[PDB]
Each structure stands twice: as structure tokens, then as C-alpha cells.
């Protein structure tokens, strides 16, 4: 992936996290579990929803009867009409195919970007109060209860609360 997170330094996804696209897995003395990150998930949903709706809704349609009837002394204009229909077909098929190919690439990149940004945001607030393992994980140098890790997910984590 372009941003190197999904199928990246984070090798796989979580079937355990049902409630969002991006999120956290935590483990402390109180237990372990999954939590989706609502801000990044909802922002992604809004973005992707906007893209799909753009592709669908920017299509403008007027009432059209495509077919025309020509007699046997009208062959030339009959083939002109066919050239128009066939020409529109070539254009829409090619463009629709490539639009989907290209924008699927961008959608998957977008997700990759979102995971990386989330990761680096968490990294910045924790700083040296935690160790970076790899695979997207941080080992705290202090004890973080459900209230503390919630502050990490909330973006409110207090660095000079903790030391050592």
C-alpha cells in the first residue's frame, strides 16, 4: 500500500473490531478488548460516501428515446445513428471502467493513509512514555488503566502525568 500501513508494518485486520474501520486494541490489568476510533472512522465514512454519491449523482440524464427507424433508402443515416450510439458506448464503457479502477486504488490508499495518520497521532502523544513494538503496538512504560487508555483514544492523554 502507498502509505505502508495496511498489509504494511501492520500486517492484518481485526475481525474482533466490529464497530468501526479504524481503531485500537488495548490490554491492561482490567482486561483487554477492541475499540473503534470514531473520529477517523466517521471522517472516512463521510469522505467515501461523498465519493460514491459524486460518481452516481454527477450523472445527468434527460428523457431520451434512443431508437430510430429508417427505410431501405435511408441506410446512410441509419449507419450514422449507429455510429453515434456505438461511439457513446465506447466512451462510457472505457471511462466507467477506468474511473472505477483508478478510484478503487485511491479508496484503498485513503484507508491506508487513515491508519497511518492514526498510528502517528497516537505515537506523538505517548512519546517516550511508551515503547514502539511494531505491528502497530505500543508498550507503556507506566500502567494504563481503562481510564488512561481512553484518554489516548480520546486524544486527551496527559504526558507529564506519567514518567519513567
Amino acid at each position: 500500500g502507498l502509505f505502508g500501513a495496511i498489509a504494511g508494518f501492520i500486517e492484518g485486520g481485526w475481525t474482533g473490531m466490529i464497530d468501526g474501520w479504524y481503531g485500537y486494541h488495548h490490554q491492561n490489568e482490567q482486561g483487554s478488548g477492541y475499540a473503534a476510533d470514531q473520529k477517523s472512522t466517521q471522517n472516512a465514512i463521510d469522505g467515501i460516501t461523498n465519493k460514491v454519491n459524486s460518481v452516481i449523482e454527477k450523472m445527468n440524464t434527460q428523457f431520451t428515446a434512443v431508437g430510430k427507424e429508417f427505410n431501405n433508402l435511408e441506410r446512410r443515416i441509419e449507419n450514422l445513428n449507429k455510429k453515434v450510439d456505438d461511439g457513446f458506448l465506447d466512451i462510457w464503457t472505457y471511462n466507467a471502467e477506468l474511473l472505477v479502477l483508478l478510484e478503487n486504488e485511491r479508496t484503498l490508499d485513503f484507508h491506508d493513509s487513515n491508519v497511518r495518520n492514526l498510528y502517528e497521532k497516537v505515537k506523538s502523544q505517548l512519546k517516550n512514555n511508551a515503547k514502539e513494538i511494531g505491528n502497530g503496538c505500543f508498550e507503556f512504560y507506566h500502567k494504563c488503566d481503562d481510564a488512561c487508555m481512553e484518554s489516548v483514544r480520546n486524544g486527551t492523554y496527559d504526558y507529564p502525568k506519567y514518567s519513567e
Binding site: 485486520g13 486504488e105 484507508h111
Partner: protein, 321 residues
């Protein structure tokens, strides 16, 4: 104590293509391509299409005796013909500007048939009883329901003059015909006058027709021909027929307000009471999506026709459970 950053995975088997990689399994996706239809011919703009039964448009307009399902709605949003619409002009000849007329009738409102020249009162000096085996009904020789075959009464065919003023407040479609006997003997037997003519005129229409007597191959066992003509008579205008012979006179005509932008579908699919915004010869389709592979020739507000068998847009991410 640890916290990890990760992303969603699930049991989705959905695949999409990307410019870099084919067949990528993703957690969520949406279809951009309408690939199915309902197998029905439906109403467009809330109005059913015209169904002509055994007949094509020519047979319906002229009143081919094999149609005789003479009841039409006052409006229709398009026209359906089937593999069973075989009954056209039963007496052979040319139908002038046939495709243009079919186009102009593809959608209409306020459509009504009326008796423009009543058979009983319109022709005191001519015989109206002419029939032909070429247009038969119930095993008997017959004729078009909307036209009258005028022939001589008792060895004389005097010059006729008949006019109609359109007071209907909308266009009147007038159809008529001109008969061309195979022999001069037939000409005399039918119309008495070897020098016969038919003249038709209005504000925009001007023509004089002369019988063309010639050897021709028999079609439906007729060496003669009837050419069929029409005009859309404007509100307030007059149309005038004069003939010393060979006139196949209007009997019934049609008043209408022509619509626009519709067409004719040829399909054997059954007509139903459903509503659609896009009709194909195969059946109606949902018009919500931008692309369809059902059929290039459509009537409605329709997705663009494409050759694609699959257009699927990734929404969720790469599925890696």
C-alpha cells in the same frame, strides 16, 4: 500494558478491481452497474404505452379489418409493437413518409378518432360499398374501417367535392388513398372515367393524383395498388378533396396533440401496470445507478449503456482477516 492500532476485517467475499491489482477482496463495496430488468413493459411518465395487438401502426391507422381492437387510450407515452404485429396495409401499395408518421405518433395526448366524412350522408352520388378479398374479415371480402372505397353509381361517377374544417382545437390526422387499377377496363368498370384524377388541398397540402394503369405483380392476389397518404391538418384549416375517380376517401380520422421525444419499442415482453423511468425491450430497469448493460436502445431517463459486466466500487478497505 499495551495499546495497538489496527483496522477492520470481516467475512466479506466482495471483490473489486484496482488499477494496480485485480480481484482485491474488500470489507465493503457498492455496485455501480444495473445488470438486471423486471421482464415487463411498464408505464412511462405514469402512462401506459399504445398496444396494437395483431397490427402495426399502418394497419391501426387505416383500420385493417384484422385489427378491429379499435379502442385506444386518449394518451400514451410510447408505442409497443410485437413479433405479432403483422397486419398493415392489406391492399398493396406505398405508405408515404411512414417512418416520420410513426415517429410523430410515438407519444400523444387528447387522442381521439372521429367520423370525418360519415359514410351514410357524405356521398349521395357515389357507391361506398367497395370491398376486396385482400382485406378480409370473418372469411368475407372487406375493407379498411377508416376509409371508404368510392365507386361509380349506375354507370356514372360525377366529380365529387368534399371539404372538412378543423374546429377540434388541435391537429387532425387525415389519411386517404389513391387506387391504381391494373387495366383500363378495370378503371372504367370502377370509376367510368378514363381521364380520372384525385385532388387534395389545404393551406400546406397541394396535390393532384392521376391513375397509373400498368402491369404489376400480384401482391395478396392484387395486380392493382393503393397508395396511402396523410397530413396533419392544423386547427382552423380546411382540407378539400375533389375526384373524378380512384379516391379511397377518408371515413374516420384522428384528432390529437402530438407529444415529443418518445419512440417505438419492439418487444414480446408483457405489458403491466408498473411504473418505470427507463424502459428496455427486455424489461424495465432501475434508473438510480449511472450505468447499465441491459440494452443500448432505451426509452426514458436511463443509465448510460455500457459493455461492462462488472463495475464495483470499493467503499471499505482491503479485507485481511
Amino acid at each position: 500494558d499495551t495499546i495497538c492500532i489496527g483496522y477492520h476485517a470481516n467475512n466479506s467475499t466482495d471483490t473489486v478491481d484496482t488499477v494496480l491489482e485485480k480481484n482485491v477482496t474488500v470489507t465493503h463495496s457498492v455496485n455501480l452497474l444495473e445488470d438486471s430488468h423486471n421482464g415487463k413493459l411498464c408505464k412511462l411518465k405514469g402512462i401506459a404505452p399504445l398496444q396494437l395487438g395483431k397490427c402495426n401502426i399502418a394497419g391501426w391507422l387505416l383500420g385493417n379489418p384484422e385489427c378491429d381492437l379499435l379502442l385506444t387510450a386518449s394518451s400514451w407515452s410510447y408505442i409497443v409493437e410485437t413479433s405479432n404485429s403483422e397486419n398493415g396495409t392489406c391492399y398493396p401499395g406505398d405508405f408515404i413518409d411512414y417512418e416520420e408518421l410513426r415517429e410523430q405518433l410515438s407519444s400523444v395526448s387528447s387522442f381521439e378518432k372521429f367520423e370525418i366524412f360519415p359514410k351514410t350522408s357524405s356521398w349521395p352520388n357515389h357507391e361506398t360499398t367497395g370491398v376486396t378479398a385482400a382485406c378480409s374479415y370473418a372469411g368475407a371480402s372487406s375493407f379498411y374501417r377508416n376509409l371508404l372505397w368510392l365507386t361509380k353509381k349506375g354507370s356514372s361517377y360525377p366529380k365529387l367535392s368534399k371539404s372538412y374544417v378543423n374546429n377540434k382545437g388541435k391537429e387532425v390526422l387525415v389519411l386517404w388513398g389513391v387506387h391504381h387499377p391494373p387495366t383500363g377496363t378495370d378503371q372504367q368498370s370502377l370509376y367510368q372515367n378514363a381521364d380520372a384524377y384525385v385532388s387534395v388541398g389545404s393551406s400546406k397540402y397541394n396535390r393532384r393524383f392521376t391513375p397509373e394503369i400498368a402491369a404489376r405483380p400480384k401482391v395478396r392476389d392484387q395486380a392493382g395498388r393503393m397508395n396511402y397518404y396523410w397530413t396533419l391538418l392544423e386547427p382552423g384549416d380546411t382540407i378539400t378533396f375533389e375526384a373524378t375517380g380512384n379516391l379511397i376517401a377518408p371515413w374516420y380520422a384522428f384528432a390529437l396533440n402530438r407529444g415529443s421525444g418518445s419512440g417505438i419499442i419492439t418487444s414480446d415482453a408483457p405489458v403491466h401496470d408498473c411504473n418505470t423511468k427507463c424502459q428496455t425491450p427486455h424489461g424495465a430497469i432501475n434508473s438510480s445507478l449511472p450505468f447499465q448493460n441491459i440494452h443500448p436502445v432505451t426509452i426514458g431517463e436511463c443509465p448510460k449503456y455500457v459493455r461492462s459486466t462488472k463495475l464495483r466500487m470499493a467503499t471499505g478497505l482491503r479485507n485481511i482477516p
